[PDB]
Amino acid sequence: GLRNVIYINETHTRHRGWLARRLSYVLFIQERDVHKGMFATNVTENVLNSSRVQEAIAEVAAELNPQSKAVNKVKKKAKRILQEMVATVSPAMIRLTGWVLLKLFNSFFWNIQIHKGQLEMVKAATETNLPLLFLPVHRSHIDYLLLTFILFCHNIKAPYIASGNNLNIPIFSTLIHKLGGFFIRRRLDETPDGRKDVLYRALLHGHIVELLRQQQFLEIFLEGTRSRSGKTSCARAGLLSVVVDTLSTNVIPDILIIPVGISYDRIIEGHYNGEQLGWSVARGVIRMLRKNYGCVRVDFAQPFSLKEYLESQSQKPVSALLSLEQALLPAILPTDESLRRRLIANLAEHILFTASKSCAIMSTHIVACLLLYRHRQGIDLSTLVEDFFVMKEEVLARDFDLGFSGNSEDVVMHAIQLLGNCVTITHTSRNDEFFITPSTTVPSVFELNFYSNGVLHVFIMEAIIACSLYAVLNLISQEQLVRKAASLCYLLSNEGTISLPCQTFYQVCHETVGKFIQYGILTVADCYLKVSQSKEHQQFITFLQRLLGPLLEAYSSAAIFVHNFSGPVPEPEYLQKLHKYLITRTERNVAVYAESATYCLVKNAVKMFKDIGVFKETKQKRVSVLELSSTFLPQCNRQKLLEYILSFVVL
């Protein structure tokens, strides 16, 4: 029971006729309920006459004086900030854009998909007069257009978008303002001199408080940059802090939060290989628009009350303070302000996990995952389809929705075409059937791994258990296995999201080991578990072990490089030196997985070593220097770290 948003017929309009059926797209746009009264009125002057914004202007004035006529200058400066921040929505512009996007999307997307039952729950959240917060996952540039367009198509008033200062340029900026995008400064720092702009913070905080006070829907991307690995990066708690600061003071009654999972079959930007490693524009843009991409599916997670969440947290016991170093180091080597700063960081992480889980599994996503890990060398089309059907059902067994819904045979033939740069379709002698082999070259591999990462969040937990089984072997004690897997969670903590922030890594592995008993892979003999020895079960175990190949091999390779590290180094210079070493391994052909050379896994590897405390980080001016820690100063300790990460990866 889904709905296509792009599909428009004489049935969708009120008037049916020879003329009307031709102008169907125009008739649909003239039947929307966007009548201008609902949007924010007189924002600028309502922000200027807020007590704190006046206190900020009043204090910045009291700094510049060596009687006090300089309030007008800083007030005029403060007005000029708001002039280029606040969005002025024009429903005239909305309808024109909506008509253009309906034509453009219908060209280069095969369809867009909405679950009706979900969007009735968003409609119910609109029917209550109370402000909403739409928090989507950032995948592509098309994310900005999709969320607004889907509400506009169900005549829910268009949201105000927290727009990056990057997009603010002459002429083009005022078009964004008409469509509800309000530009926000990056880093709340105009210049180092004076530190934070007390004036600018007051205006930003004031604007958001004023915009929520008039009961209107807000859209914030928690991931500052769109993901280049193909999986959700770490959260940013910058704007949520203001929203919670609003609700904390009891200036507004309550806010409803909606995590939004957007999924593409093939993103418009295509591959990311260029940034994943290290006239002319006009040719590239025209070549992009003519290419027809696959399906799209936007899912809305059930909305919750921020007040009810924030209360529920205040009832919970003492938050665990276990440090990543304090957790792991024992295994490898045998505050009033901070409490709230943790509370917002947890909320942000909690939303992104809910948002990431809501994203549907596309045909491409599965095909990539099967090609890279289940076969790799190459397999026949008839054989690939039989494996595709077995993969398809495993995703539905864990309660994830699929984007593809057609015939199993066809969907794969459609999916292979979209990965045409990565894949080659040959002919086997004496076999009237297509043979497929994925590209193992460093430029091509990355593109497959990007679309393959789409399915990783389904199997990430079982994969952590599947690796632990191999680690504990080289009968299994229940307590011993879970403790081993719990340590691997802290190691792979930095990359992606593994569990909900409320649940500890122990109990998640403990219930995942519980699920392994249900499936019948492990059987009960503290308790002793036996691994089942069947042709069907083993190929599932080996699949899950290979699925954490790149993630572990990158860390293994990074840990080897750490051996020959001398003297303090700048991090931006160090990342380049480390990245080159992983790229070298793929050229020499000593590396098992070419996927591991990706830049995202280099950032994670270095950011992970900081948390364990291999690198001591003192920072000055802009760039932070990396000093070798007192614990990992000697040669023997660096080898002990390498050995531990090696124990997980297959040999």
Ligand X SMILES: CCCCCCCCCCCCCCCC(=O)OC[C@@H](O)COP(=O)(O)O
The reply to whether 287 sits in an annotated binding site is: no
Q: What is the C-alpha to C-alpha distance for residues 607 and 281, in angstroms, rounded to an integer?
A: 35
Contacts of residue 429, defined as CB under 8 A and 6 or more positions apart, other chains included, come to: none
Instruction: Choose from ligand X, ligand UKL, none: what does 181 bind? Cβ within 5-8 Å by kind.
Output: ligand UKL
Contact between 164 and ligand UKL (CB under 6 A)?
A: yes
Contact between 196 and ligand UKL (CB under 6 A)?
A: yes
Q: How far is the CB of 596 from ligand UKL (least distance, A)?
A: 29
Contact mark string toward ligand X, 110..149, x via CB under 6 A: -------------------------------x--------
Indicate which single residue of 98, 206, 496, 550 sits in contact with ligand UKL (rule: CB under 6 A): 98
Instruction: Choose from ligand X, ligand UKL, none: what does 397 bind? Cβ within 5-8 Å by kind.
Output: none
Containing 279, the helix (H) or strand (E) segment is none
The reply to whether 69 sits in an annotated binding site is: no
Indicate which single residue of 84, 269, 394, 611 sits in contact with ligand X (rule: CB under 6 A): 269
The reply to whether 342 sits in an annotated binding site is: no
Contacts of residue 415, defined as CB under 8 A and 6 or more positions apart, other chains included, come to: 265, 294, 363, 364, 366, 367, 404
Contact between 194 and ligand UKL (CB under 6 A)?
A: no
Could you tell me what percentage of the chain is helix, strand and coil, using 3-state DSSP and rounding each to the nearest 5? 55, 10, 35
In sequence order, the β-bridge partners of residue 299 are: 261
Distance in angstroms between the alpha carbons of the first and the last residue of the chain:
47
Instruction: Choose from ligand UKL, ligand X, none: what does 167 bind? Cβ within 5-8 Å by kind.
Output: ligand UKL
Indicate which single residue of 93, 198, 252, 268 sits in contact with ligand X (rule: CB under 6 A): 268
Q: How far is the CB of 209 from ligand UKL (least distance, A)?
A: 15
Q: Are strands 615-619 and 624-628 parallel, antiparallel or unpaired?
A: antiparallel
The reply to whether 483 sits in an annotated binding site is: no
Total residues in contact with ligand X, by rule CB under 6 A: 10
Instruction: Choose from ligand UKL, ligand X, none: what does 632 bind? Cβ within 5-8 Å by kind.
Output: none
Site for ligand UKL in 313-342 (CB under 6 A): 341
Q: At residue 576, what are phi and psi to the nearest 5 degrees?
A: -65, -45
Instruction: Choose from ligand X, ligand UKL, none: what does 236 bind? Cβ within 5-8 Å by kind.
Output: ligand UKL
- Nearest partner of 121 among 289, 299, 327, judged by Cα: 299
Site for ligand X in 272-331 (CB under 6 A): 272, 274-275
Are 24 and 10 in contact by the 8 Å Cβ rule? The answer is yes
Contacts of residue 573, defined as CB under 8 A and 6 or more positions apart, other chains included, come to: none
Q: How far is the CB of 242 from ligand UKL (least distance, A)?
A: 8
Indicate which single residue of 270, 303, 378, 501 sits in contact with ligand X (rule: CB under 6 A): 270
The string of DSSP letters for 35-67 reads -STTS--SHHHHHHTSHHHHHHHHHHHHHH---
The reply to whether 577 sits in an annotated binding site is: no
Instruction: Choose from ligand X, ligand UKL, none: what does 238 bind? Cβ within 5-8 Å by kind.
Output: ligand UKL
Contact between 186 and ligand UKL (CB under 6 A)?
A: yes
**Type of residue at 446:** F
Question: Which residues in the chain are followed by a discontinuity, with C-to-N distance exceeding 2.5 angstroms?
Answer: 66, 278, 334, 474, 525
Which residue number, 59 or 643, has a Cβ lying nearer to ligand UKL?
A: 59
The reply to whether 430 sits in an annotated binding site is: no
Are 624 and 616 in contact by the 8 Å Cβ rule? The answer is no
Tokens coding 174: 């005022």
Total residues in contact with ligand UKL, by rule CB under 6 A: 33
Contact between 52 and ligand UKL (CB under 6 A)?
A: no
CA dist list (Å): 225 to 47, 149, 228, 243, 370: 29, 22, 9, 21, 29
Q: How far is the CB of 404 from ligand X (least distance, A)?
A: 24
Binding-site residues for CoA: 186-187, 196, 201, 236, 341
As annotated, the binding site includes: 186-187, 196, 201, 236, 341
Give the residues lining the site for ligand X (CB under 6 A).
100, 104, 141, 268-272, 274-275
